């Protein structure tokens, strides 16, 4: 329950063929996570996103992005399920979402100190993220 | 060419009655700024935005936001024209755009060290912003 290969991971940028039943297992460590159904809606409302799927259709990594298509984009969420980390998938998802976004002037995201090096190795630079967290709505605004 | 009052500043969240001719004077300090026509398109593509206007219809402050309406939003641009700063307008624009966004779990933005206190006084907290700047496209992706 340990050996892995990225060789039969496939990527897609639509929800065609993806059900909420295939979006379970995310939000590791979140106290009150969006459900898989809510994740599906989050993806549907993103400007762009990238999914990494095993052959059975389970989504084991994703990234989403907000964008105006003209000047700016931001990347709210990036996650690879723990058994699939350390293979380069997170970096690959980031490269793929940047391709989907195009060469916009600004692409920005927030992170904690521990993951700064992950992002620096992708070429991102570091400034201040000012933020709000409305923890009552951590599971998402309902439909 | 110095006295000001916010008393006849009006706010709006649509482009009704706003022309590109009324969106001049922004991007102070930018080497290759979006034109007013491009700014109009940026606003039109935002999830939400707030404009501050004088009685003649000139826009003298704005803020925009990207959002998925479910979990996350980000604020790419905030600017008040220099003769209108130091009256509370920037803070007011921020409060108004947060109202337009609603109580989403995440609201995030990037900034330099100098403006951190402005954002802390609005209740925002500080983390790392990881970012890319594609300076060739500073004036925006064309229509
Ligand atoms: C960050 C994340 C997406 C990286 O995915 P990944 O597929 O392992 O990415 P890569 O294989 O390209 O890079 C992995 C490297 O990133 C670094 N890294 C990732 N998370 C780290 C952390 N929390 N602390 C320290 N280093 C970290 C490590 O150098 C790691 O290499 P290692 O496995 O040899 O230690 C993954 O760790 C994850 O899903 N974490 C939980 C959610 C998260 O923190 N996402 C970031 C936005 S909040
Ligand atoms: C940041 C900005 C929007 C604030 O607008 P404003 O209408 O003056 O906002 P407020 O009146 O609510 O707050 C002003 C206070 O913010 C702080 N502040 C704003 N910019 C600052 C800066 N560059 N360095 C230090 N303090 C700053 C000061 O405390 C200032 O008070 P002061 O005029 O008495 O010195 C305005 O300075 C601006 O348009 N700057 C250029 C664009 C920008 O930096 N926007 C931020 C996103 S990049
Ligand atoms: Ca879509
Ligand atoms: Ca490894
Ligand atoms: Ca609109
Ligand atoms: Ca003042």
From TrEMBL, chains A, B:
Residue span, N-acetyltransferase domain: 13-143
Which Gene Ontology molecular-function terms are recorded? metal ion binding; N-acetyltransferase activity
Extract the coiled-coil ranges from the record: none
Cross-referenced InterPro entries = Acyl_CoA_acyltransferase (IPR016181), GNAT_dom (IPR000182)
Record's Gene3D superfamilies?
Answer: 3.40.630.30
Q: Which residues bind CoA?
A: 78, 80, 85-86, 88, 90-91, 114, 121
Q: Which residues are involved in binding Ca(2+)? A: 86
- Keyword annotations: Calcium, Metal-binding
User: What protein does this entry describe?
Assistant: N-acetyltransferase domain-containing protein
Name the source organism: Deinococcus radiodurans (strain ATCC 13939 / DSM 20539 / JCM 16871 / CCUG 27074 / LMG 4051 / NBRC 15346 / NCIMB 9279 / VKM B-1422 / R1)
